[model samples]
Target chain A: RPRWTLSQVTELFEKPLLDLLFEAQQVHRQHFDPRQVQVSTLLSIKTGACPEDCKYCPQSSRYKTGLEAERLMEVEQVLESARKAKAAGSTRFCMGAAWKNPHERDMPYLEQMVQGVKAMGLEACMTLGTLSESQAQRLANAGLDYYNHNLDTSPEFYGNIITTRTYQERLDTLEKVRDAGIKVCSGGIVGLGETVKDRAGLLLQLANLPTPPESVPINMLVKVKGTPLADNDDVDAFDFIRTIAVARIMMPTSYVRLSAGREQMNEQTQAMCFMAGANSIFYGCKLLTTPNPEEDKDLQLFRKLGLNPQQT
Target chain B: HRPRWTLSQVTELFEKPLLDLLFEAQQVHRQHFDPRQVQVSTLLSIKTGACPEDCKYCPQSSRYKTGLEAERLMEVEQVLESARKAKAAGSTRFCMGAAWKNPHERDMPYLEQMVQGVKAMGLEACMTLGTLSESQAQRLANAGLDYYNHNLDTSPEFYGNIITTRTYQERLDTLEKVRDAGIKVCSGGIVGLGETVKDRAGLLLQLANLPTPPESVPINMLVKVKGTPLADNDDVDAFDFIRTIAVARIMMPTSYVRLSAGREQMNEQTQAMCFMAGANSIFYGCKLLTTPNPEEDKDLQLFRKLGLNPQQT
Candidate 1:
């Protein structure tokens, strides 16, 4: 017999719930070695004025976050950011852009930025929305270490999040990125008001992928002002930690970073999250369009908690 | 003899009698603690619609045409009044959630105000304001926020099929920021998201690595919604859910494993069985912050039947 069924798991949620937690703790101790992972950092190469209308983004033209649409950063500017990230003890430097696709018009500058970061000897990563086959090849050719494209949530729930693209389209982009020999870093956000089953469906899809992503970034919603979800209520502390633990169990060896919403968590909870199998983190003061924990505080926390920043 | 299943052992059970297992587990639980109920808390989404991320399951995402209308953040007074009502309903904690992928600098002041309001009402103020930076973590801590919530959601191996914008490493960084700031974390994930038994085990294993385990863990079952990516999926079998409870108990012994989100689909016997298996907490009223059906009556009845009393805080 299979060890557990849907009914049994459901039944475990009722009264006397503490026992389940105790058991989960015991299981945690047996399977995991006590060690925390290293910290990384994210830099925005291109911010604001995205072509897509993803409901959760403030940079999209559809939202009114009042961001000025800007072009991709010059190569030197991006490289400067990389230098700061490296100095801040960030092992991986991720550059993000607010665009649906890498436009042909911006290819030269994009290439320059990738090569510039590569020259700095940083583990270069980028999120330029979705990429086509050729664009994926270009990034790989530029020595890009990882390409991030999230599936967001389950296929069933994808429609409510955006109408500009289909879920299949997003998957196809990952396929293209993989086909081009680029490492894929993808993940979803929780607390978007999705049901637990929807999260399950999302995992099933990821596990069954022909080429699973190497890194997963689980973000909780921050509800940006002037956006469609500026005031949506979608998360809780308990659920957030549980999701991290669950993700670690499901992904095993994949690099799991607590992306985005770090400011919302306290030191103890963040440490608890790392204990739950998260092995990576951002090391800088900001993440893409959002503000984040500063490097000094992160370094102090790591030193106090005995964690090493991931170094390449 | 009743099977003595540890957390790992629970993961190995496929078709066992769920109720019996829960009962057996309950016996084990009673040895360390008394049966009691936690105050049921409800979270209402004062601000509905309009999110920026492309998270697949959210109706608020612009990526999908779920037809949800956007609403602005509620006034602090409005939120305070809601807290009053929640406390009246015997809720011990009140959490405020927003849908941005991460909290930005501009939104911090408003959130700080909300946290203050929650504190004024003697309710534990919690916020899920998305990913954190170090400064933001310190600020929230300074604001007297009781808990900061961010979810890992699923195993790393299965994360890509969900969202694309951020990496899981970034999520961990945010959590680290919260930890460095010394805020209590409430984190957990939803089950029946189509993960395997090993994946489930992996989750528990991950939780064990925390320097300090989470004070509270909420395990939610998938509630398939229409017009989203995973609407028509099959319901996770009740048995597996119980096994998750048992396994979680064995894995994180001291954490408050809560049955969150999809309780309406569960029967009283099933819920009771969960308590026996190790789940000691639940949302007493409606699921705060989702489209949940309130089953307060069922909760009360189940507690009485189980001969349990509320936990004295």
Candidate 2:
């Protein structure tokens, strides 16, 4: 059921910001603990040199971002970082690889990574670009809790940000992950030069899925030098806050992760984001390649806001 | 009987998640007034210091050793000059405040002349001259006084802690006199005087449950001057102050909920949050009575930044 129409979502986006935030907070409280943020550490298992051309990504091989490419870490090494993440109060540990799709040979190592992280009792999630049906099954069998596959933006505005993949291809991978009994984690990035209508379109596509994603990571586009959008004007603070509120309203039970571009945002802006129902954040000092707010600063903010890490 | 707001109803609204409280306040706010327009008023201290009453938060109290210099009331001509300046700077209301327990009979002529002159200049003339006699209220009313501000200060049960010189009933009597004399009542209280949330709610309930709720409610955060009794009072949580503003908005949906004193100590974001939480008025000069206010340029820039227009007379 396309329970949410584009017009309906856009209407929510256009609401007085306070009204939208209030409504979002009500929805958030219904399905989740409003004060417990799910902190996830995103480790770039394979850094940079992506084959795809994501206009806002510094890791794209097509862009001269000067990022160093590395192969996937061994199971032991990945588990060590996972240990530290859990010790730092992170309940979920995410491993991301910069690839159009994980190669057939790399599937075995990916499975071990998932198994090792699960053994630590932390929720394990992965974003290895697109996944084949078989690849999705292997990760699920290895005890992966979630699979991240962001659509990046609305279908109509998709061409402007990335031309190498179609919106359907993104959906196909999401469905494959869902079919494999792994919870789907998909969302979009804002500040990609898309209109408010496009934001609605992106959310509509997610909400109308067979089951809306269990985790929706709404990223603020990180403008890395050398990426096409590096010089793009900053997204207005209220606009970004409004986007978070709308996502919370549209997916009442989903984790709306405040992902990327957080380093540049002020404490007030981040506090406003939490007030608007952003209940998940990428922890640790690095979000893959882009920097994240320091862990100490993150804890200080949580202390100020009366927020605690989500319990396992 | 007026449909009075109960303490439970107000407390529930006040205790909501901060965002929820602000949103509901904004909703009630939009129903009654323009969300983008804020009523701006200029407050001029007509007479400086030597107040007879002992408000724990007041620097003007003769009881405290606060180094404020007492001065005679401004002449009518001098007040008119400030009114002209306020009007030129986009204030629709010119408020004159005198530090007194009650105005003396000898000051009536000067107070009446001040009101008549300010009203003549196309500004709404408001005065806060402490408690008013029935005749004094009528006199200012006949002189075209648009508003009279007499603050209730705190909840009835907690009132003894903040001020002992005058009773809460005395404040209500003045408010009644102002209303009977056809003047709009500007009555509210100050937070951050070491009061509890229940105390804050009790104060608001008293205001909302009045024969007629105040036409203007000025919610002040205590600006702890160095020599006042509350100078060592703990800092009030910023969110708590915002919650009080939102509650006032919800209780008196149509009144101008002005962000009064202690505004200078608040940062831009806190002030912005207050505006979003339905604070629709501000004292718009560098000086609010004796305490500092955000500069005129800063207020203008804030209005521009938040897209707020100054309400016209």
Candidate 3:
């Protein structure tokens, strides 16, 4: 009898004077425990020279973030990064490559990297843009733990941010990854000037997935220099916190990790975020081609807050 | 397109399309504001437990055995050191919460000193020192306190069912005194208190009765501490929470409608919906009154995915 109706929510948006946060907070505590997520780490396997123009991305040939183009690292080199991540106490090790989409040229090396990480006793995750069915199977066969292909935002909002990819194409890639038996790890950034409805729409889409992603990595825009978004500032700390809190409510059991742009957040905000029920993180010096929060500082934060990274 | 409704008339009609209402209010908001980003504020409970008053939602009240230790206020320096750490963590606000019915004269000097030290660090000093008398409000204001919080908790008719130690009128008077002392009033009620939709609506109307509405409305959810009076109060559904957010935006058009206490219960989608519903602010760290939150990784992802950047200096 006390529950809110959709109309009531519509009404709440108009009041202009009501503070819904107090109640949202109560809902948060009722449904979930206050625990921090474990930290994962990412290593750039191959950076730059991506043929795609996913406008938000820095590696795309369509934009220049001043990143030096490089090819995929050899198996041994990737293995070394995995060892360092493991030593740094990362439970998940992600390898990101720049590509228009997963290609035949990249599949064998990607498979090798997956196997190498698996051998090193870390959860192997990979992001190489859209994946073909066969490439997904290859990565899964090589024991890739998670396949990440973010929807980025609502279908309606996607075009303004990325032109090269269709919303359906992204969804299909997720399907490919899921069909290959890899746990999907998908989520997108906010503060792209998207409306709150767009955010809710994205969650609805993700929730409707045949098997919802086991992990959702939410990225806050760091606004890389030389990228189109370099001068844009569309989100603030409160917006960031609300998004995380709302995400936790919608995806009660998924691993919600703060991905890139964490370096912009101060420790107080980060600590508060942990209390909002996020339970995972990317533990490294960089997030693929983008700069990120340092692993040591993350470790120190964990220790200070009495939280432990997820241990495999 | 012709005559704009006055604030009072708008409150009376209260029938504008929700989006139209939000858009119009946002225009007014934009006229005076340009994204003053939130500063992280760390909460340190100075004195915990053994409170004489029995607030239904609190873990520190004697009615609950939530494993909180009953301790007197920490020494001034200890509170100062926490503020220092908060500053290092990039917080511009430092809030000290104490469990008490009201601060007696015996605690005033210590409270003043605590406020002084926190302000010295250039952090906004906020206090939830429970209910207060007029003079106590003046003393706190004189100490350079920036804000005082005294939540309405819920509607008056239903309030007694939630808490027995304090009356709704008493809470209002304390807020009045705080405002009279020129301190910014930061007060809002908790939702999910088993109150009806009308009761939630009434709470908003009550808030509007104040001379100037609360500058900050911190909407918290009931954490339902074990063994507390309202421990079993799970009357709130997620839909109810969002509706509360949307409605709050309509009611408090210009205030900072924050995502407070129960962030852990929400997902990114729900939080985003709340934002669309018109919430523009949130507590950056853990709830001063409760626990649970999304970690930094998730927070950053939510921001980056939305193409949002933190409000910079």
- Among the numbered candidates, top TM-score falls to 2
TM-score of 2: 0.79
C-alpha RMSD for every candidate? 23.1, 4.9, 17.5
Tens-digit lDDT track for model 3 on B1-313? 2223244543442343332333344344444434223324567787877877777777887766778757778999999988887687666677898888889899999999999988888889999889888888889888889999888877788888788877789888888889889998888888887887766766776776567889888777777777777788765655456556656665666677776677677765456545544555665554454456665456545544333346322
DockQ (C-alpha) of model 1?
Answer: 0.02
Could you give candidate 1's per-residue lDDT for residues B1-313 as a string of tens digits?
A: 2223344554554323333344345555566545554435566664666777765555666676677667788888888888888887777788788877777788788778888888878888878877878888899889888887776666666556555667756776776678778887777777766677766665665654566667777788877766667666678766567777766665566677777778777765456556756787777765556566656675666565454575322
**Residue clash pairs of candidate 2:** none
Off by over 4 Å in 1: A1-34, A309-312, B1-313
Give a tens-digit lDDT track for model 1, residues A20-132.
33443344445544344656687778887777887788788888888767877778888897887777666788888888888887877777877877887778888887788
True contacts kept of 2: 0.07
The Cα error of candidate 3 at residue A212, in Å, is: 1.6
Better of 1 and 3 by lDDT: 3
How does each model score on TM-score? 0.50, 0.79, 0.50
fnat, candidate 3? 0.00
